[PDB]
Symmetry: C5
Subunit: 258 residues, 5 copies
């Protein structure tokens, strides 16, 4: 692709607006947005998480107005986590901080991640423990070895399916993803406080150092997200991941290529 | 609205200055600014908070000089009023340890403010969809399990005080094009309040095209939540504590077609 | 006051340099810089703090070279807390963190505040608890009602006296103070660590958005400050506010007005 | 070297892309990326760590297209690879409390990376000069009590993998003119890892005169440490956990005399 | 009167060095550490031993002999040996059963200054009845006002292992010919956060474009880097400090 000039005129821009729901595990029909309570294996080698205990990456492929050579170029993004105030419910069967106290709020390990691309997000597999048995119905690094704990280049995949790719197994592949922009923060530790900002006044520019944004192959925009906000502690002490949805607004323009 | 030129001249600007009081629940005649002590339900399905235990969004609709021209909100100065009150650690609080001072207000906070030319638009999200919200509050109706992540049926306008519980509602990011909003949720039982005050900081309300909120019907809409944390009494029971918020907004007349 | 031009020439500038001592309560002749140990009332209605338990705002009214219409205009400020390293004394009958350990350092709730104006700082009263009986010798919000716990516009005052205005009752009135610049941070929580920066290389500009600094009425510059650094914990577990002095260096120039 | 002009033309730029794996100790065939469990000596003077308990600096020498012209390193993109693996809180860790999830990796971290046109230069500093460092490591020799603060005899090059323990060595600030290095030590047993990833951030490697590292013998030297914290097992024993680091470096041809 | 800067190959020079910490050095094996910290039985009987008190470090660096004066223009600085704080195996106190040792942490003071004369100090005492030990230089004739501000307590940082950190700060009412920077982070569990890089420069010029001017052709460097406290197995605690690197660039300036 030689990238040429931007088209102008009223017809030359379009806008995508949507939300991606979190996929935390959904252990029963009342617990959308939550994982199954977390249990711990008896040995390192016997690590064997249930499917409904593993948060996954979310993805949406959004069709754009048909063009044909012109391509849609993603230029700007507004994004935010939806429902941050729900985490103020400290009265719904949680564990009291101390005698007569309110319930403990959602807190601890979080991963907040989003990406915008002109093709599927490309993933690299990395395992905390290569002998972890990942459950049926997930897509996980295959033929794991001890090198998979640091870097095994065999573990390549595309984020091309929902409720499938566990967060703990996969990261954006920094050796690829030239046609995607991705942003993520892992904040680890059992007592980490959620710090969630909302505003409709902040815009991220998606242009690279040459002034070119993601170019949407086949007229599809790919949006991906994870928002594991922390863990909810129930009265018994058992803990569940809690996630929230993410809003995306992307502005695109037509770009000629050869 | 096609937005055209700004009017100039001595008559062409105006200023709104006010404060919004917090609405934390007010459980009795001595406890303005506090919620009821928080109690925990023994199951998810039996979650059933009392009205006076739920902080709500504050809102004021401010009439502007009668005026096609519209008032355009350009700048905002804002701050939380009474930050130093949180230094009262001698008033029936739980000692930090034997012979120690009382615990200050701390833990989960939500600080939020918006300025718009129409009512703030809200989207409902529920921690627990089976929570029974109390009479006298306006809350997401026909909740389902999807309401725990995103149910698009839950749309509302922040059009009334002491009504919209903070925990149920957020600004709808899919709308609000004629409002500017800003908020931070800081969660965790031991989070320290960090409250800055100064009269030297201004927030510009103009969008990327140089246009601020345009006030429909000559009304400016101001909204706020300032849940500062929880106060722990000697018994250990805990109450939300909130504070008032100052707003100063400058506006100018804008022609539209 | 229409503000007109700045005077130039060697005679046209002046400098104020000084320090404000903290007023933490001073419970006896050995405890300048400390409050009385803090006690807790059994009920809200019986809250009744002793004077020497209440830190107060510090203020100085500094006379300037006499002018008369010209007025001194405050243009820049350098400021810092004096004696930050004294908080490293962890050997002076404090409470040991653990068996054989050093003493707990000053920590917990802090308020750091300073203002420069051409008249007395204007205050608004806000009470944690409206039924608090404030002690003789202090100046506190009068005719308190339950609305005083959020905003009662009857509680207006000027910071016009030392050892008088308790920190916990009063804040700068944001509805006034047009001829003052003020800056403050409240950091609450029993374990918050003091973070105190010192340098002689930082300058704050005091000019407003029109290029005009505070104009000194009657040729007086008003400086105000609070630096409650935290609490010192004694071996017994009793706690006392600890404060430190604040340095001010202000540069001024002569300004004509009509 | 007098540095002269940059060569232009299609042939005049090149790109290096790779990853450096961490060297945390690798106590057995299943534990790449981990150290041996940490033990505490009975006395200060008997401090005597095993080799597989000591994380080491990673280094790669990368050959460049054979070229007086030299390759000049101009920009760097870098990130830690596999940050989300630290969400595994179910793999025989120590529960935070009764029925709770396992404690995540946390505590003391060192995140460090450098790009140079020759080996990173090191200075030795010891916590405890009487520490007996183990065979198979390269450590400061002829240690004295001054080695606890600054002993200028302890100079070395990062010229070998699994050799130079992190706790003994730092970049020598008195040298390294032809290298750019960046590091952060965050100490304390409960420190939370804060790991950012993005493909949109670039670090410029040019010094104040507009000159990047010049690659002697057509080799680029990359170095890294990413000790993320400690994993706590169910027994309470603790092991350092590290992750790999991505590097992408852009270079251009520079004439020198 | 400050006049023009000299140019030419001969007109610039560079100082590079390190200042070692002075934490107390309680014996011949414990350079970089203080004595274990003890707590007095009463407030009035506070009485620290010398080897328990960290002190300011200072170096006076001679410059090429030169009216012209050397003007300090830029500074690169960093703490040397940050990684040594990863030693969690050296008879420390275990965080929990079978755990590693607790790392250095808690109260820290990180401070550095560059000047054309000795750093000027002001004395402030936590407790005016503290008896400071022989061999230190401390505020004399202390009164209760010394707990907040007693202007009698002026000194120059003109000697090593002498001026205790807890007694003295840079005097903000003087030091016009010095640039100083410091951060106190207090609290028993504060985590050390130490950044290293060779890519960061601090400009030393004031608002008029003039850096410190070196009187008698001497450059004065000062530092404190109390990183926290090391906890031994017994629970006893000792300050731990590290050295600090300085690289200062200077140019010749004419004055009248
Ligand atoms: C609890 C214990 O015995 N620890 C010693 C350890 O023993 C090994 C296994 O324990 C763990 C552990 O808790 O340390 C189990 C963890 O799941 C492993 N974690 C990971 C991520 O792999 C760790 C890890 O492999 C090592 O710590 C790496 O150094 O080991 C223990 O369960 C196992 O017990 C066997 C038993 O030996 C066998 O005869 C019996 O039939 O079955 C049991 C269960 O399979 O034995 C393992 C050793 O083969 O071994 C290390 C030495 O490698 C230590 O001796 C460790 O004790 C700690 O040692 C530290 C210094 O290394 C320090 O002194 C701590 O204070 C000690 O607790
Ligand atoms: C446990 C004890 O006795 N502590 C007192 C100490 O004794 C010295 C040795 O103790 C340690 C310690 O304090 O834990 C051991 C550490 O590994 C050392 N750490 C380092 C980095 O060197 C520290 C350190 O050197 C000092 O704290 C420096 O101030 O010391 C102790 O093991 C040793 O025991 C000897 C014993 O004396 C001898 O009769 C017997 O034959 O053999 C034993 C094993 O060798 O003795 C050491 C003293 O020579 O000494 C210090 C001061 O010198 C204190 O007395 C310390 O008690 C603390 O004192 C503090 C004030 O100084 C404060 O009051 C605390 O409350 C006390 O616990
Ligand atoms: C232990 C005791 O009786 N405390 C009284 C106090 O008595 C003081 C002396 O106690 C101390 C202390 O509180 O621990 C000793 C300490 O080193 C001093 N520290 C400093 C830096 O000066 C403090 C300090 O002077 C005061 O707290 C200032 O208010 O005092 C004691 O050792 C001596 O025998 O007697 C002294 C009295 O002359 O007096 C206080 C009133 O001034 C209190 O009555 C205190 O009692 C405690 O008060 C706490 C809060 O007020 C708390 O509620 C405890 O329950 C209560 O025992
Ligand atoms: K690539
Ligand atoms: K929209
Ligand atoms: K006003
Ligand atoms: K050098
Ligand atoms: K001065």
């Amino acid at each position: 692709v030689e990238v040429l000039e931007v088209k102008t005129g009223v017809d030359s821009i379009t806008e995508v607006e949507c939300f991606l729901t979190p996929e935390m595990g959904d252990p029963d029909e009342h617990l959308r947005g939550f994982s199954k309570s977390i249990s711990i294996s008896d040995t390192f080698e016997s690590d064997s998480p249930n499917r409904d205990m593993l948060p996954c990456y979310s993805v949406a492929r959004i069709p754009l107005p048909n063009l044909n050579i012109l391509m849609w170029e993603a230029v700007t993004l507004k994004t935010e986590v939806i429902g941050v105030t729900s985490l103020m419910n400290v009265h719904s069967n949680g564990q009291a901080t101390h005698d007569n106290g309110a319930g403990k709020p959602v807190q601890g390990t979080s991963f907040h991640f989003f990406s915008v691309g002109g093709e599927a997000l490309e993933l690299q597999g990395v395992l905390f423990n290569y002998r972890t048995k990942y459950p049926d119905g997930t897509i996980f690094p295959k033929n794991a070895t001890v090198q998979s704990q640091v870097m095994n280049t065999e573990h390549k995949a595309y984020l091309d399916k929902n409720k499938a790719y566990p967060v703990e197994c996969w990261v954006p592949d920094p050796t690829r993803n030239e046609n995607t922009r991705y942003f993520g923060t892992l904040t680890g530790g059992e007592n980490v406080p959620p710090v969630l900002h909302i505003t409709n006044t902040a815009t991220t520019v998606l242009l690279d150092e040459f002034g070119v944004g993601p170019l949407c192959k086949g007229d599809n925009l790919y949006l991906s997200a994870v928002d594991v906000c922390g863990m909810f502690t129930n009265r018994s002490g058992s803990q569940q991941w809690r996630g929230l949805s993410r809003y995306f607004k992307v502005q695109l323009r037509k770009r000629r290529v050869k």
